[PDB]
Amino acid sequence: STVQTSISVENVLERAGDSTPFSVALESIDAMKTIEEITIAGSGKASFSPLTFTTVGQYTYRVYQKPSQNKDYQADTTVFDVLVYVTYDEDGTLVAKVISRRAGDEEKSAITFKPKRLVKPIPPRQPDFPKTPLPLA
């Protein structure tokens, strides 16, 4: 019997429509290995590939954001601890319960990163002529 779980994260950029890519890594503390890295273009939600568990137990991970490839931004350095508990529910069904927290925090928290832009945005090109009626003279 087996159960699967998708660990989900959010990347939040300060400007909507900013599509700068950032990468997030999932590491297993039990194995001391990186399991996977995923890349998110701009702001969005993202899941790592599903983890499959075949035996009951507690499995420990952490999730963090890699250094920003685009040097105009500072990646969020927050690290999240992620615990996956695999057991049976009241009907005897194999289930996986996932709990995430900021490292050092007691309270649970969704895994969220907020990279910050360190340099002024590149200037937009001159806008097109107006497409709406100009004010009456």
PDB file of C-alpha atoms in Angstrom:
ATOM      1  CA  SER A   1       0.000   0.000   0.000  1.00  0.00           C
ATOM      2  CA  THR A   2       1.297   3.438  -0.929  1.00  0.00           C
ATOM      3  CA  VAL A   3       0.451   7.109  -0.546  1.00  0.00           C
ATOM      4  CA  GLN A   4       1.691  10.178  -2.401  1.00  0.00           C
ATOM      5  CA  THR A   5       2.018  13.849  -1.502  1.00  0.00           C
ATOM      6  CA  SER A   6       2.755  17.021  -3.433  1.00  0.00           C
ATOM      7  CA  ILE A   7       4.689  19.635  -1.482  1.00  0.00           C
ATOM      8  CA  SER A   8       3.452  23.042  -2.603  1.00  0.00           C
ATOM      9  CA  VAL A   9       5.123  26.474  -2.401  1.00  0.00           C
ATOM     10  CA  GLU A  10       4.397  30.056  -3.422  1.00  0.00           C
ATOM     11  CA  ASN A  11       6.699  32.643  -4.984  1.00  0.00           C
ATOM     12  CA  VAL A  12       5.528  36.266  -4.653  1.00  0.00           C
ATOM     13  CA  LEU A  13       7.205  39.109  -6.592  1.00  0.00           C
ATOM     14  CA  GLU A  14       6.424  42.723  -5.772  1.00  0.00           C
ATOM     15  CA  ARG A  15       5.390  43.628  -9.333  1.00  0.00           C
ATOM     16  CA  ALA A  16       2.558  41.754 -11.047  1.00  0.00           C
ATOM     17  CA  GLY A  17       3.619  40.412 -14.430  1.00  0.00           C
ATOM     18  CA  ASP A  18       7.286  40.289 -13.431  1.00  0.00           C
ATOM     19  CA  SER A  19       8.253  36.899 -14.911  1.00  0.00           C
ATOM     20  CA  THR A  20      11.801  36.647 -13.501  1.00  0.00           C
ATOM     21  CA  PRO A  21      12.546  32.972 -12.725  1.00  0.00           C
ATOM     22  CA  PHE A  22      13.465  31.681  -9.262  1.00  0.00           C
ATOM     23  CA  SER A  23      14.326  28.148  -8.184  1.00  0.00           C
ATOM     24  CA  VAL A  24      13.258  26.333  -5.024  1.00  0.00           C
ATOM     25  CA  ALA A  25      14.876  23.183  -3.622  1.00  0.00           C
ATOM     26  CA  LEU A  26      13.432  20.313  -1.603  1.00  0.00           C
ATOM     27  CA  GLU A  27      15.970  18.490   0.593  1.00  0.00           C
ATOM     28  CA  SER A  28      15.568  15.326   2.666  1.00  0.00           C
ATOM     29  CA  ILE A  29      17.150  15.726   6.092  1.00  0.00           C
ATOM     30  CA  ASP A  30      16.770  11.975   6.710  1.00  0.00           C
ATOM     31  CA  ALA A  31      18.909  11.295   3.599  1.00  0.00           C
ATOM     32  CA  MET A  32      20.920  14.539   3.643  1.00  0.00           C
ATOM     33  CA  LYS A  33      20.282  14.846  -0.106  1.00  0.00           C
ATOM     34  CA  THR A  34      18.583  17.308  -2.413  1.00  0.00           C
ATOM     35  CA  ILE A  35      15.518  15.525  -3.797  1.00  0.00           C
ATOM     36  CA  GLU A  36      14.521  18.061  -6.477  1.00  0.00           C
ATOM     37  CA  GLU A  37      14.819  21.671  -7.641  1.00  0.00           C
ATOM     38  CA  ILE A  38      11.981  23.413  -9.490  1.00  0.00           C
ATOM     39  CA  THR A  39      11.879  26.763 -11.259  1.00  0.00           C
ATOM     40  CA  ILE A  40       8.960  29.199 -11.150  1.00  0.00           C
ATOM     41  CA  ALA A  41       8.667  32.021 -13.712  1.00  0.00           C
ATOM     42  CA  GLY A  42       7.691  35.085 -11.701  1.00  0.00           C
ATOM     43  CA  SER A  43       4.873  34.890  -9.161  1.00  0.00           C
ATOM     44  CA  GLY A  44       2.928  31.653  -8.804  1.00  0.00           C
ATOM     45  CA  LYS A  45       2.168  28.485  -6.868  1.00  0.00           C
ATOM     46  CA  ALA A  46       4.187  25.363  -7.573  1.00  0.00           C
ATOM     47  CA  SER A  47       4.391  21.758  -6.455  1.00  0.00           C
ATOM     48  CA  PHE A  48       7.449  19.540  -6.378  1.00  0.00           C
ATOM     49  CA  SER A  49       7.049  16.195  -8.120  1.00  0.00           C
ATOM     50  CA  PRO A  50       5.024  13.858  -5.915  1.00  0.00           C
ATOM     51  CA  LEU A  51       6.788  11.895  -3.178  1.00  0.00           C
ATOM     52  CA  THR A  52       5.715   8.278  -2.850  1.00  0.00           C
ATOM     53  CA  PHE A  53       5.753   6.528   0.540  1.00  0.00           C
ATOM     54  CA  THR A  54       5.384   2.808   0.999  1.00  0.00           C
ATOM     55  CA  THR A  55       5.895   2.538   4.761  1.00  0.00           C
ATOM     56  CA  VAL A  56       4.488   4.326   7.804  1.00  0.00           C
ATOM     57  CA  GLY A  57       6.821   6.709   9.640  1.00  0.00           C
ATOM     58  CA  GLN A  58       7.917  10.327   9.883  1.00  0.00           C
ATOM     59  CA  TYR A  59       9.958  11.901   7.083  1.00  0.00           C
ATOM     60  CA  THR A  60      11.745  15.222   7.414  1.00  0.00           C
ATOM     61  CA  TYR A  61      12.523  17.738   4.672  1.00  0.00           C
ATOM     62  CA  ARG A  62      13.318  21.345   4.241  1.00  0.00           C
ATOM     63  CA  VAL A  63      12.550  23.758   1.472  1.00  0.00           C
ATOM     64  CA  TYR A  64      14.418  26.934   0.546  1.00  0.00           C
ATOM     65  CA  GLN A  65      14.934  29.307  -2.368  1.00  0.00           C
ATOM     66  CA  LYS A  66      18.180  29.177  -4.364  1.00  0.00           C
ATOM     67  CA  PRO A  67      20.313  32.309  -4.881  1.00  0.00           C
ATOM     68  CA  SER A  68      18.779  34.557  -7.510  1.00  0.00           C
ATOM     69  CA  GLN A  69      20.143  33.898 -10.990  1.00  0.00           C
ATOM     70  CA  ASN A  70      19.113  37.417 -11.912  1.00  0.00           C
ATOM     71  CA  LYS A  71      21.414  39.576  -9.782  1.00  0.00           C
ATOM     72  CA  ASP A  72      18.909  42.451  -9.803  1.00  0.00           C
ATOM     73  CA  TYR A  73      17.040  40.455  -7.093  1.00  0.00           C
ATOM     74  CA  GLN A  74      17.818  39.083  -3.626  1.00  0.00           C
ATOM     75  CA  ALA A  75      16.260  35.632  -3.147  1.00  0.00           C
ATOM     76  CA  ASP A  76      14.223  35.096   0.016  1.00  0.00           C
ATOM     77  CA  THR A  77      16.586  33.400   2.511  1.00  0.00           C
ATOM     78  CA  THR A  78      13.779  31.981   4.671  1.00  0.00           C
ATOM     79  CA  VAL A  79      14.082  28.216   5.232  1.00  0.00           C
ATOM     80  CA  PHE A  80      11.055  25.980   5.852  1.00  0.00           C
ATOM     81  CA  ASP A  81      10.996  22.725   7.780  1.00  0.00           C
ATOM     82  CA  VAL A  82       8.564  20.220   6.305  1.00  0.00           C
ATOM     83  CA  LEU A  83       7.406  17.123   8.153  1.00  0.00           C
ATOM     84  CA  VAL A  84       5.505  14.319   6.413  1.00  0.00           C
ATOM     85  CA  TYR A  85       3.745  11.885   8.725  1.00  0.00           C
ATOM     86  CA  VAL A  86       2.646   8.617   7.132  1.00  0.00           C
ATOM     87  CA  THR A  87       0.208   6.530   9.136  1.00  0.00           C
ATOM     88  CA  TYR A  88      -3.303   5.004   8.977  1.00  0.00           C
ATOM     89  CA  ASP A  89      -6.494   6.994   9.466  1.00  0.00           C
ATOM     90  CA  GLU A  90      -9.522   5.802  11.428  1.00  0.00           C
ATOM     91  CA  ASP A  91     -10.639   3.515   8.590  1.00  0.00           C
ATOM     92  CA  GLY A  92      -7.231   1.880   8.153  1.00  0.00           C
ATOM     93  CA  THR A  93      -6.381   3.852   5.014  1.00  0.00           C
ATOM     94  CA  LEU A  94      -2.744   4.888   4.484  1.00  0.00           C
ATOM     95  CA  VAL A  95      -2.512   8.683   4.642  1.00  0.00           C
ATOM     96  CA  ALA A  96       0.247  11.337   4.569  1.00  0.00           C
ATOM     97  CA  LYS A  97      -0.088  14.500   6.668  1.00  0.00           C
ATOM     98  CA  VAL A  98       2.232  17.364   5.773  1.00  0.00           C
ATOM     99  CA  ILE A  99       3.170  20.190   8.124  1.00  0.00           C
ATOM    100  CA  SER A 100       5.428  23.129   7.269  1.00  0.00           C
ATOM    101  CA  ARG A 101       6.927  25.808   9.483  1.00  0.00           C
ATOM    102  CA  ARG A 102       9.512  28.544   9.141  1.00  0.00           C
ATOM    103  CA  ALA A 103      12.749  27.217  10.611  1.00  0.00           C
ATOM    104  CA  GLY A 104      12.789  28.151  14.302  1.00  0.00           C
ATOM    105  CA  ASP A 105       9.040  28.877  14.412  1.00  0.00           C
ATOM    106  CA  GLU A 106       6.560  26.813  16.399  1.00  0.00           C
ATOM    107  CA  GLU A 107       3.481  27.843  14.413  1.00  0.00           C
ATOM    108  CA  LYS A 108       2.710  26.213  11.060  1.00  0.00           C
ATOM    109  CA  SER A 109       3.069  28.398   7.964  1.00  0.00           C
ATOM    110  CA  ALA A 110       2.533  27.941   4.219  1.00  0.00           C
ATOM    111  CA  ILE A 111       5.794  27.762   2.278  1.00  0.00           C
ATOM    112  CA  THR A 112       6.097  31.235   0.710  1.00  0.00           C
ATOM    113  CA  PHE A 113       9.058  33.164  -0.722  1.00  0.00           C
ATOM    114  CA  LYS A 114       9.194  36.881  -1.513  1.00  0.00           C
ATOM    115  CA  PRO A 115      12.295  37.822  -3.530  1.00  0.00           C
ATOM    116  CA  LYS A 116      13.040  41.571  -3.468  1.00  0.00           C
ATOM    117  CA  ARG A 117      14.323  43.675  -6.349  1.00  0.00           C
ATOM    118  CA  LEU A 118      17.525  45.503  -5.389  1.00  0.00           C
ATOM    119  CA  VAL A 119      17.890  47.728  -8.443  1.00  0.00           C
ATOM    120  CA  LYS A 120      15.424  50.096 -10.086  1.00  0.00           C
ATOM    121  CA  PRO A 121      13.323  48.447 -12.809  1.00  0.00           C
ATOM    122  CA  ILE A 122      14.522  48.704 -16.411  1.00  0.00           C
ATOM    123  CA  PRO A 123      12.600  51.557 -18.053  1.00  0.00           C
ATOM    124  CA  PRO A 124       9.569  50.509 -20.153  1.00  0.00           C
ATOM    125  CA  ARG A 125       9.545  51.631 -23.792  1.00  0.00           C
ATOM    126  CA  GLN A 126       7.506  54.709 -24.644  1.00  0.00           C
ATOM    127  CA  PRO A 127       3.849  53.683 -24.357  1.00  0.00           C
ATOM    128  CA  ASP A 128       1.736  53.534 -27.518  1.00  0.00           C
ATOM    129  CA  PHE A 129      -0.587  56.402 -28.410  1.00  0.00           C
ATOM    130  CA  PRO A 130      -3.758  56.447 -26.270  1.00  0.00           C
ATOM    131  CA  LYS A 131      -6.506  54.003 -27.258  1.00  0.00           C
ATOM    132  CA  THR A 132      -9.188  55.854 -25.310  1.00  0.00           C
ATOM    133  CA  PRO A 133     -10.775  59.236 -26.135  1.00  0.00           C
ATOM    134  CA  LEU A 134      -8.594  62.168 -25.091  1.00  0.00           C
ATOM    135  CA  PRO A 135     -10.121  64.773 -22.797  1.00  0.00           C
ATOM    136  CA  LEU A 136     -12.136  67.395 -24.517  1.00  0.00           C
ATOM    137  CA  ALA A 137     -10.510  70.723 -25.110  1.00  0.00           C
TER     138      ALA A 137
END
